[PDB]
Design a protein around this ligand. Structure first.
Ligand SMILES: [C][C][C][C][C][C][C][C][C][C][C][C][C][C][C]C(=O)O[C][C]([O])[C]OP([O])(=O)O[C][C]N([C])([C])[C]
Ligand SMILES: CC(C)CCC[C@@H](C)[C@H]1CC[C@H]2[C@@H]3CC=C4C[C@@H](O)CC[C@]4(C)[C@H]3CC[C@]12C
Lengths: 207, 56, 286, 339
């Protein structure tokens, strides 16, 4: 039958594209407006899909945030992602409060109970000079401890990691982004390859 | 901004207000009448014989 | 019997009175442990299992469980029958099946051990699920069958296939059919041991990036849990076979080898399944 | 400021609206259909199990001839099935893999898609050159496309996540009519059998009935307290049923302008994902997030049957025009035909 042969041809194409799409990392990108997401995506409308290849691995990044609608009605389709990329602009202070709330919402979703976070603390170079003009302790009601960068930067990590209520099932990876971009893509690959390695352990009844 | 929205919102209620509403019991009987009229034409309700069933 | 004969060229007479009691209890509860393990697995074989990698582990676990159950019942009836009344009716047949099923059990644990090694170093390398299933059965059963048939086709015509005391492969001095079982057993354990250390390195990997220490002693409890569940399923308790080969006269080694391996059925139900929190809550409630 | 006076004027109009509905609320359909015999327990078996999708199936639409079936999945492939023989006719590689709705034209010549890409894509099935191609690419919505239905070969109505429904002309690719009034994101819409008036359910727990020719909200129904996810007309066309995130299906009458039935159970606590009606309208089929569907008697609010057999949340279902079978597409990438 010609119709049966047509279905067989279609099946080959479906499986051919399925294995091709099975190697896609399929990451999810979030963050505040103008929070350094451009640097983390351009190192090489609604949501935009960006693709870059690193070490013979193809990555898909979805810049969610341009929808401006009820996120809970379409955030369930972003499951099965390898991890979540978060961008925090350390230079901005007023946008940090909404960034923490946005980070709080994503980590506590019932869909994202196991997806890791590879949050990036951007603009660390501009944070050195800007903190001198306006101290972190004075700007925020909560105490920032020592004014040194070795403690102020670590304080931001404490305020972000503690938002994760699921410590056991989620592994937050933190990195600082600088002018160079060669190592920026390396961290994503290292973080992703650690998640898939760890994910196999749960499926093998080991973790 | 909000003044224009309030002006348009109140006009919609007035348009919706002056409509003809029949009795619920009269409307309820119409739904029951339609189901009884097309009861024989519902293959899901009445088990279709496999001879004329295309999904058998 | 003493259950040490599987790996023991000679069983001393002093251990036999004391070692026989623990192994019979161990074999007895092993049969019951496997029955419950298979029953609970059969009900929830595919209802909750959907991952492609988890698909491979389910078939490996039932194959290990199935091999141990049938081999154990063949072993218990292979030692309770006299070798003179029925030297071939019940004694010869039991030895071949016991030897082949144990070899299948050893080789199946290699497939499970290789599978863990495959998903750790070759994380991005993906082959078809059916292709992995086909090659696993070919080596899980076909390779032990290849070794088993040549064992009965070489030693048996020489009439040195049967030990006088017990229905099991003879040791002798000229013909050593037991090498067809001892050597594969140590080879699988040795290959499994390096797989064990490979998992240990991944759990002990340093923090990626500038992540703080955060929780303390969180990784060490995973290590203890991993070795508790991985040791019986990989047959790491069978490593004592080399100890009884070299000396075969130690009081302690025969006891520990007998009790640990005879209880492997209990270490599968209690540790392989019950310890697994993924299926632990789904079973206790109902 | 005259804003306070306007709000008071609007408030008293709502009181008049509910008082007028309360006058006819004395009679209830639940106490009227107690005399008719119940449909009883009904059994449905999976005659066919369409497989081939590699991701969650969000939408499906039955063919106008009750034979062809189109489904959309997050894998990025839109597949037209032959339900009789399980065969596959087409497999469209959608440009955007984030598809949330799909429609099959009543003439059987066009298929539409849409989702997080903010645009509606229409594909010409009957192409003389062989492989199908994107006939038109409707754009203009600032929110995700939640639903789309074909009025004819040149008219399509779309539900968007910008609290606005629109009617599009395929030839020019422009919004002929824009429907506004929803304060929440519109999730679904249903067309009347005469394709003259349609009702859309939104996230503001309200279903508004619109007029295609005019472009105005004729009626508004507020019976739910959560997001409305499923809208389906009665076969007669004078009533429709709504599915919400409260495991409650409510039947509204257009002429009575009041909720009639409330299909709910104590056991179910999930949310409705899709609803449908049989040819006679006596049987109501509603999708659920608890991995299985339910069958409701539309005149007695009794659970006539259960359509369990899916390993994940049921996302879409539909009944053929001839009412011969009901399909169901869940998140386990499997389409099942029940009869
Ligand atoms: C029935 C159930 C089922 C069963 C399970 C199991 C089966 C099979 C096994 C395997 C499979 C196959 C293998 C692969 C390998 C490759 O390819 O590649 C290599 C290079 O790459 C090389 O690598 P290296 O690094 O050198 O090493 C490796 C090692 N191992 C262990 C992994 C092998
Ligand atoms: C990690 C723990 C739980 C299990 C270890 C199992 C294996 C690796 C152990 C158990 C018994 C061990 C043997 C015990 C005694 C001897 C005799 C001497 O020649 C040293 C090596 C040798 C031959 C050991 C080799 C390693 C061995 C086979």
């Amino acid at each position: 039958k010609a119709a049966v042969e047509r279905s067989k041809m279609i099946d080959r194409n479906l499986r051919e594209d399925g294995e091709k799409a099975a190697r896609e990392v399929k990451l999810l990108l979030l963050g505040a407006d103008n929070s350094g997401k451009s640097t983390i995506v351009k190192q090489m409308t609604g949501i935009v899909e960006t693709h870059f290849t690193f070490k013979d691995l193809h990555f898909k990044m979805f810049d969610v945030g341009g929808q401006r609608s009820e996120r809970k009605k379409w955030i369930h389709c972003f499951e099965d992602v390898a991890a979540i990329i978060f961008c925090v602009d350390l230079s901005d202070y007023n946008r940090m409060h909404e960034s923490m709330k946005l980070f709080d919402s994503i980590c506590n979703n019932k869909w994202f109970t196991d997806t890791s976070i590879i949050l990036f603390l951007n603009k660390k170079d501009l944070f050195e000079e800007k903190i001198k003009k306006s101290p972190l302790t004075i700007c925020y009601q909560e105490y920032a401890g020592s004014n040194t960068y070795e403690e102020a930067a670590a304080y931001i990590q404490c305020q972000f990691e503690d938002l994760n209520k699921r410590k056991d099932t989620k592994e937050i990876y933190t990195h600082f982004t600088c002018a160079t971009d060669t190592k920026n893509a390396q961290f994503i690959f290292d973080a992703v390859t650690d998640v898939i390695i760890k994910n196999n352990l749960k499926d093998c009844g080991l973790f | 901004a909000s003044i224009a929205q309030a002006r348009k919102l109140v006009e919609q209620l007035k348009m919706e207000a002056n409509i003809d509403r029949i009795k619920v019991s009269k409307a309820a009987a119409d739904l029951m009448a339609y189901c009884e009229a097309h009861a024989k034409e519902d293959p899901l309700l009445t088990p279709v014989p496999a001879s004329e069933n295309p999904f058998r | 019997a003493s259950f040490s004969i599987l790996m023991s060229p000679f069983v001393p007479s002093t251990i036999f009175p004391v070692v026989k009691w623990i192994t019979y209890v161990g074999l007895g509860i092993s049969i019951g442990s496997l029955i419950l393990c298979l029953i609970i697995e059969a009900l929830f074989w595919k209802q909750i299992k959907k991952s492609q990698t988890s698909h491979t582990r389910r078939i490996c676990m039932v194959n290990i469980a199935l091999s141990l159950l049938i081999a154990d019942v063949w072993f218990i009836v292979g030692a309770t029958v006299d070798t003179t009344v029925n030297p071939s009716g019940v004694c010869t047949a039991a030895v071949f099946f016991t030897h082949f099923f144990y070899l299948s059990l050893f080789f199946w644990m290699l497939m499970l051990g290789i599978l863990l090694a495959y998903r750790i170093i070759l994380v991005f390398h993906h082959m078809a699920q059916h292709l992995m299933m086909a090659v696993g059965f070919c080596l899980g059963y076909g390779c032990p069958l290849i070794i088993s048939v040549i064992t009965i086709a070489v030693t048996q015509p020489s009439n040195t296939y049967k030990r006088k005391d017990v229905c099991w492969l003879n040791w002798s001095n000229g013909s050593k059919p037991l090498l067809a079982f001892v050597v594969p057993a140590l080879a699988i354990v040795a290959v499994n041991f390096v797989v064990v250390l490979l998992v240990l390195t991944k759990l002990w990997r340093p923090t990626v990036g500038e992540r703080l220490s955060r929780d303390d002693k969180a990784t060490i409890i995973r290590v203890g849990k991993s070795l508790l569940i991985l040791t019986p399923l990989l047959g790491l308790t069978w490593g004592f076979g080399i100890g009884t080969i070299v000396d075969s006269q130690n009081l302690a080694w025969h006891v520990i080898f007998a009790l640990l391996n005879a209880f492997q059925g209990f270490f599968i139900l209690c540790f392989g399944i019950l310890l697994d929190s993924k299926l632990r809550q789904l079973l206790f409630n109902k | 400021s005259e804003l306070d006076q306007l709000r008071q004027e609007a408030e008293q109009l709502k009181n008049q609206i509910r008082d007028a509905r309360k006058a006819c609320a004395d009679a209830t359909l639940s106490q009227i259909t107690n005399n008719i015999d119940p449909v009883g327990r009904i059994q449905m078996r999976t005659r066919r199990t369409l497989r081939g999708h590699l991701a969650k199936i969000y939408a499906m639409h039955w063919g106008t001839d009750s034979r062809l079936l189109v489904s959309a999945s997050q894998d990025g492939k839109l597949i037209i099935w032959d339900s009789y023989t399980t065969n596959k006719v087409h497999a469209i590689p959608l440009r955007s893999s984030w598809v949330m709705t799909c429609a099959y034209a009543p003439s059987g010549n066009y298929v539409a898609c849409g989702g997080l890409d903010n645009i509606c894509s229409i594909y010409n099935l009957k192409t003389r050159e062989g492989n199908v191609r994107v006939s038109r690419e409707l754009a203009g919505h600032t929110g995700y496309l939640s639903c789309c239905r074909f009025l004819d070969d040149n008219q399509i109505v779309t539900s968007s996540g910008d609290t606005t429904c629109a009617l599009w002309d395929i030839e020019t690719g422009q919004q002929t009519t824009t429907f506004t009034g929803h304060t929440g994101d519109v999730m679904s819409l249903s067309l009347a059998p005469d394709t003259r008036l349609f009702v859309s359910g939104a996230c503001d727990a309200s279903a508004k009935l619109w007029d295609v020719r005019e472009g105005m909200c004729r009626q508004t129904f507020t019976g739910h307290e959560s997001d409305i996810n499923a809208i389906c007309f009665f076969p007669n066309g004078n009533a429709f049923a709504t599915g919400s995130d409260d495991a409650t299906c409510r039947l509204f009458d257009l002429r009575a302008d009041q909720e009639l039935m409330t299909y709910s159970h104590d056991n179910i606590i999930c949310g409705i994902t899709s609803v449908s009606f049989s040819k006679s309208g006596r049987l109501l089929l509603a999708g659920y997030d608890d991995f299985n569907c339910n069958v409701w008697d539309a005149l007695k609010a009794d659970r006539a049957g259960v359509l369990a057999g899916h390993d994940n949340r049921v996302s879409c279902l539909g009944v053929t025009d001839d009412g011969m079978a009901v399909a169901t597409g869940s998140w386990d990438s499997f389409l099942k035909i029940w009869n």
